[PDB]
């Protein structure tokens, strides 16, 4: 289909439509991503990613069109630590995607250890809010908390210095507007507090023509919980 | 997901999310839900169906909420005889839905012919665009074309006298709306010439609650093709 939509404004245990890789599953309403105790807890070493299973036209050769798309969501982080780890992204990747060996903690199980920061060697798009940037393990990351543009590199080629807030929903706006091939960011707290960040790539240089979109989350040797809360998408085939 | 939305404008040769069944199959941008030769032909006791691979949220009982759908969608019949048969539908079916035995011909590939009418052994609605009523073979037609509105049986509970156009498309704009249980077609060709049918059902207590939409089509000794066009399908779950 040139144009696809859903919406989850929270996210019930009866489930059809989603893919869950990892330890991701449904609790309360909302996806943990990550791994939780019997009291609902985070613990260590733990990834999980949840996909929408109908696939998304990204992009049409035969027709020289790219699509115009829009992802809403809002999760929420908690932890008894004081450097929770390690963050959740929002991604589009191939349909056949899966998590890769040894994708956890700083990797956001997004990328394989081996070739994370080899943008010939991955196809991926992601926008990810990361909470740990230890310079001696996430050599990578600026030196703070951050929301970044990831293309094909865990190494953001963009990011944004951003506040974590225990427990409070962050509300997210991702869009990419063909015309422009801007891809931009806008996140915001309760409280009016706002983040944005905005980025030019050609998509289809970097994605195939058909993708899946969803979102993944790690943590290694520090935690927290990666709780999706609520999410909506629609993308439109436009002529450019 | 509470709401999705699609639209297939046209259908090109590449399909990712769409489940084939029977003899249909993509061509010159359209669906041909039944056989044809190499000229592209028509053929005899050929049968195919095509469904939307996401599954629908039609109902949840936890929050008493109903979904509001609408199906918008064209199609052409051609034939190189007079009384080209048997016709294509629209139907909302359990996820795991399959071809029948036996289902071809007047049967329209929905139902199995031991059970056809009994309304208690099915789970389907359907809209059929009905060309052939023999009174020998179907025995449960009225006896003319028509649209007619099926409900757990082939014999219909609403028809209404409808004219078949050799090589014309027919518009067709199927509504459910859950605060009424009106499940309302409206079918148009070019010149306006105007069909309406409608039937007041509870969804509720024919199908499961998440189920699968597609359309199927057949050919039994007569025969004509059966071209879907185009295709755009939303619903919403609603409290009423
Ligand atoms: O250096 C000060 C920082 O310490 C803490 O962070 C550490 C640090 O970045 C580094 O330390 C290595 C070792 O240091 C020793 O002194 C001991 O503390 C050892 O226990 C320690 O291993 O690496 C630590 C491990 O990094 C993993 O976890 C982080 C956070 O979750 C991830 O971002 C990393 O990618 C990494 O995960 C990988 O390894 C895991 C197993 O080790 C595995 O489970 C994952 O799948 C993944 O492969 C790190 O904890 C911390 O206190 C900082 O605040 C402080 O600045
Ligand atoms: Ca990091
Ligand atoms: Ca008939
Ligand atoms: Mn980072
Ligand atoms: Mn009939």
Redesign the pocket.
Known sequence: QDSLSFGFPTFPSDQKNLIFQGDAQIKNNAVQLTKTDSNGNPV??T?GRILFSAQVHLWEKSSSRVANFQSQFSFSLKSPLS?G??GIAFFIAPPDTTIPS?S????LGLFAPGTAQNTSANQVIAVEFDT?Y?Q???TWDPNYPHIGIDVNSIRSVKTVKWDRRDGQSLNVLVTFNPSTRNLDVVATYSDGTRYEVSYEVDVRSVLPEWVRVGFSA??????QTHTLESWSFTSTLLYT
């Open positions: 260590a070493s990834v450097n780890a390690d040894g956890g903690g700083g990797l740990f230890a001696d393990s996430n790690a943590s290694g040797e520090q935690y």
